[PDB]
Structures are given as structure tokens and as C-alpha cells.
Amino acid sequence: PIPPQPHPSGARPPQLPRELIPRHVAIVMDGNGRWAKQRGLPRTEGHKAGESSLFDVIEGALELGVPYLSAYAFSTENWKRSPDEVRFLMGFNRDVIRRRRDELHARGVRVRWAGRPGRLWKSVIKELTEAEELTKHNTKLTLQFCVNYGGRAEIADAAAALARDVAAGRLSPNRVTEATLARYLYHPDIPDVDLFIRSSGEQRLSNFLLWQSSYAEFVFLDTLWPDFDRRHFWQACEIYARRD
Amino acid sequence: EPIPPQPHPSGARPPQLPRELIPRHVAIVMDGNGRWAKQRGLPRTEGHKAGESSLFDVIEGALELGVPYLSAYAFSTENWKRSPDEVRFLMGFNRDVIRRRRDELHARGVRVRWAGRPGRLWKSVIKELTEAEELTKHNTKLTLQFCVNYGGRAEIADAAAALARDVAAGRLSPNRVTEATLARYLYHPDIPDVDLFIRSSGEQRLSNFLLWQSSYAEFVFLDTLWPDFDRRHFWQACEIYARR
């Protein structure tokens, strides 16, 4: 695997005991809009900046040795936004995956798409699907790239799939437990969230890896997502460690 | 005709908030009983005893302000941090509290709903909870979801299990399983989403409480240890919620 490029600031990963480094970090990447309003830029420029944020945080995860990183790329809540914002976000998240696919393959990043095909463009589904196939043998970092995703939707899809196995006689209805339902999540081999980072001031789960975040530590930072990089990730990991 | 709540000794009055900004459902984790006892050189069990007065004062605060739904995490099934003796005490205690307070609650128009599993709960605990439910079942001023032997994942798994029984019996199609379907099989489907999730102590976690229902909830993390917590802290949390 090609090593991560270090930060322009020359900041280095904190020396933490391996036992206190979170195995799975989840990030809600919010404030792309708010950031643009504050700098008199259009909302689209916030999202553009957010691309570099994610890719820096991925470097931070590789440097520190965090093996699972989940990113809330496109929430089903986005369907409530304007047609023009949704058109931009589809085209953007597609173009980001197409542009950065090869960089991720090289650094040993396994891309897992979590979410529903639903009303996504077929071009978005295609890029995500291909990125999954290309990277499916990598093991250095798993990026759970959550596109058209909701935590309730994932649990409902798990219950639906469980229900099909019950109907077909493959599973008894009296053997339906937490562990049973967990087997039917989108990516059951991905473990629980240890650290849930919410970039901005808004102190909410927002329907993200709901089942998986039940016992997670929450870290609420003030940094809008376009100003977020590996140093804010590292700070959140340090806060996590000090909580032991 | 419900008897009104007793006002606070301090003579503190509920904040004047627009009805639209008062949370419909508040969920509370009651943390710091142990720490509070340690500070006063008392055994951990005395903190829990003190917490009773905290819960009852917060209920008065909910009635004064007009919050119709209040959920309390009285007893988690996963007491993995606690000693066998403290767990044994907490089963008996939550039973004794519901016995001692059911009539006060009946009088103030509080409907008690038990959320949790009969599981390994003593028959005596189930009895007191069940009788409190029956006594109060026509009240409507406040719903107290008293969560005893409860976990968020357990409730979702039990929902999926009940859904699975209906599928096995041919009462329900497995391709008709959606968020709304699964939500009908929760312990109390008529109790709405959590608007405000209050965690009394510094520990910033869901701790597996009303997981499905807290998907879009606002989290408010206070510093107050639970025995020092009363309607004024509840009201502060509702003010923080409104100012959002």
C-alpha cells in the first residue's frame, strides 16, 4: 500500500496506546452550506471544499491506524432540499468517487457503499458499485461511504431480509434476536461505531448508523466540515482516549 | 380532574416558551448516583435513593411546562459496569419506587407505560409495573415511559421477532416490510419520536436507550449529577432545545 501524504502543517498523528485508538469512527460532514454563507461563496463551493476534508481525514485514519471510517456523504434527508441542490449533490458525489477511486485503491482503502439505490441516478449507482468491486480485496482502511442512507431504512431492510428467510423456512421466528437482525445489516462484517464525530455545533445522530452507534462515544466539534482535516479527527480520537 | 403539580421549594416557575418550541417527548438518562454518594462518603445505593426525588421533581417540571411524553432509563438490562449487589438493589428499588409513587402519579394524571422485557426480572417487579400500568391507563396529562429491563437494540429485535411471527403465520408479506411496518411492532408504537434526549452527567453517549425513537432527537449533555437534578435542569434543557 502507498503511504498517506503527511499534512502541509507538518502535524503528526498523536502517540496513543493501540487499545485506546477507536476501531470504527463515524463522521457526519455538515456545514458545507453554512461555511459558504459565512465566506459569501455559493453553497456548491462548501461541498467542493468538503471533498478535500474527507480525503485529508482518510489520510489521518491511515496514519493513526483506524481500520474503519464511515462518512455520511448523502442523507435521504437531502430529498427535502431544492431540485438544483439535489442535482448538484448527485453529480458531485459521483464525480468525487470517479476522480478519487484510484488514489483510494492505491492507499489500500476498501470502499463499501451503504444505502439504497432508490431514486439515485444510474451513473451514481454505477460509480459506487465499480468502486466497491475495484477495492473489495483492500484491508488497510474500510471507508463505509453512506450514499442515499438512513439508519432506520437500514434496520427496516435488515428486518425485511430476515422476514424473507422466515417465509422461506430458512429461519425460525423464535430465533430472532439482536445478533440475528445484525447479520442482515448492509455490512455486517463492519463492527460497532466506537467514536461518532459531528463536525458542526448541531448535537444530533441525524439517523446515521443508528443500530451501530448504540454504545458509541459522541464528540461534537465547532469546525464546519470544509475547515475539518486530520488534525480535528486526531483531536476527536484524543478526546475518545482520555475518556478511558 | 387532575390534581396540579406541587411547585418547587425555590418558587422557580416554568419558562414562558411558545407551545411550538416545547418538546413533545423528552428522554432522560439518570447518571451519577454513584459519584454523588462517593462525594458525600455514602454507599452508591444512597445516590439511587436520592435519584427517586430527582425523577419525581422532573415529572412535576414536565406537568408544569406541558411536555406530554417523558421517558426515563430506570434499569438497563446491560449493567456490565455495576456490581451484582448494586444490580440486586436496583431491581428491588425500581419496584419499591413504582409501588410508593403510583398513587401520587395517578392523582396528577400521569399514565405509566412499562417498556422492557419480562426476561430475568423478578415476578414482584413485573407485578408492580403491570399494576401501575392498569391503575393509570386512562390518564392523558403526561405519559411516563418507565424503561425497566430495557435496551434499544432489544426493542428493535423484539419488533423484528413479532413482525417475523406475523410473516410465518401469513398475516404479513415480507415485501411489505418498511420503516412504518417495523415501527408498529415497538413496545409502545403510539409514543412518538424523542424530540430532546437529556444525559444528566458528563458522559456523552446514547447507552442503547430509545435507539429507533432518538434517530432525529436533540442531545443535551448537562454536568449535574442525577441526585442534584430537578425540574430547573429539565427546564434549562428545554430552553437549550427551543433556542435551537
Curated annotation (Swiss-Prot), chain A:
Q: What does the Swiss-Prot or TrEMBL cofactor note state?
A: Binds 2 magnesium ions per subunit.
Its UniProt entry gives the catalysed reaction(s) as:
(2Z,6E)-farnesyl diphosphate + 10 isopentenyl diphosphate = di-trans,deca-cis-tridecaprenyl diphosphate + 10 diphosphate; (2Z,6E)-farnesyl diphosphate + 11 isopentenyl diphosphate = di-trans,undeca-cis-tetradecaprenyl diphosphate + 11 diphosphate; (2Z,6E)-farnesyl diphosphate + 9 isopentenyl diphosphate = di-trans,nona-cis-dodecaprenyl diphosphate + 9 diphosphate
Q: Which InterPro entries match?
A: UPP_synth-like (IPR001441), UPP_synth-like_CS (IPR018520), UPP_synth-like_sf (IPR036424)
Q: Which Gene3D superfamilies match?
A: Decaprenyl diphosphate synthase-like
PROSITE patterns to which the protein is assigned, alphabetical: UPP_SYNTHASE
Gene Ontology terms: biological process: polyprenol biosynthetic process
Q: Which domain of life is it from?
A: Bacteria
Alphabetized UniProt keyword annotations: Magnesium, Metal-binding, Transferase
* Chain residues that bind substrate: 31-35, 43, 47, 75-77, 79, 81, 198, 204-206
Care to name a GO molecular-function term for this sequence?
magnesium ion binding
* Active-site residues from the entry: 30, 78 (proton acceptor)
The EC number of this protein is 2.5.1.88
CDD domains with a match to the protein in the record? Cis_IPPS (cd00475)
Q: Where does Mg(2+) bind?
A: 30, 217
Q: What does this protein do?
A: Catalyzes the synthesis of Z,E-mixed prenyl diphosphates by a condensation of isopentenyl diphosphate to an allylic diphosphate. It shows a large substrate specificity accepting dimethylallyl diphosphate (DMAPP), GPP, E,Efarnesyl diphosphate (FPP), E,E,E-geranylgeranyl diphosphate (GGPP), neryl diphosphate (Z-GPP), and (2Z,6E)-farnesyl diphosphate (Z,E-FPP) as allylic substrates. The enzyme exhibits the highest activity when Z,E-FPP is employed as an allylic substrate.
Family classification: Belongs to the UPP synthase family.
Q: How does it assemble?
A: Homodimer.
Q: Protein name, please? A: Trans,polycis-polyprenyl diphosphate synthase ((2Z,6E)-farnesyl diphosphate specific)
Swiss-Prot record, chain B:
**Which Gene3D superfamilies does the record associate with it?**
Decaprenyl diphosphate synthase-like (3.40.1180.10)
Q: Which SUPFAM superfamilies match?
A: Undecaprenyl diphosphate synthase
Q: What would be one Gene Ontology cellular-component term for the protein?
A: plasma membrane
Report the active site residues: 31, 79 (proton acceptor)
One Pfam annotation reads Prenyltransf
Q: Does the keyword field hold Hydrolase?
A: no
Single GO BP term:
polyprenol biosynthetic process
Q: Cofactors per UniProt?
A: Mg(2+)
- Can you name one GO molecular function term for this protein? prenyltransferase activity
Where substrate binds, per the record, is at 32-36, 44, 48, 76-78, 80, 82, 199, 205-207
Question: What reaction(s) does this enzyme catalyze?
Answer: (2Z,6E)-farnesyl diphosphate + 10 isopentenyl diphosphate = di-trans,deca-cis-tridecaprenyl diphosphate + 10 diphosphate; (2Z,6E)-farnesyl diphosphate + 11 isopentenyl diphosphate = di-trans,undeca-cis-tetradecaprenyl diphosphate + 11 diphosphate; (2Z,6E)-farnesyl diphosphate + 9 isopentenyl diphosphate = di-trans,nona-cis-dodecaprenyl diphosphate + 9 diphosphate
Quote the cofactor binding remark.
Answer: Binds 2 magnesium ions per subunit.
Record's keyword terms, sorted: Magnesium, Metal-binding, Transferase
Q: Where, by residue number, does Mg(2+) bind? A: 31, 218
Known EC number: 2.5.1.88
Keyword Transferase listed? The answer is yes
Which proteins does it associate with, and in what oligomeric form?
A: Homodimer.
NCBIfam families with a match to the protein in the record: PRK14829.1, uppS
* Membership in a protein family: Belongs to the UPP synthase family.
What is the recorded function of this protein according to its Swiss-Prot or TrEMBL entry?
Catalyzes the synthesis of Z,E-mixed prenyl diphosphates by a condensation of isopentenyl diphosphate to an allylic diphosphate. It shows a large substrate specificity accepting dimethylallyl diphosphate (DMAPP), GPP, E,Efarnesyl diphosphate (FPP), E,E,E-geranylgeranyl diphosphate (GGPP), neryl diphosphate (Z-GPP), and (2Z,6E)-farnesyl diphosphate (Z,E-FPP) as allylic substrates. The enzyme exhibits the highest activity when Z,E-FPP is employed as an allylic substrate.
Please give the name of this protein. Trans,polycis-polyprenyl diphosphate synthase ((2Z,6E)-farnesyl diphosphate specific)
User: Taxonomically, what lineage is the organism?
Assistant: Bacteria, Bacillati, Actinomycetota, Actinomycetes, Streptosporangiales
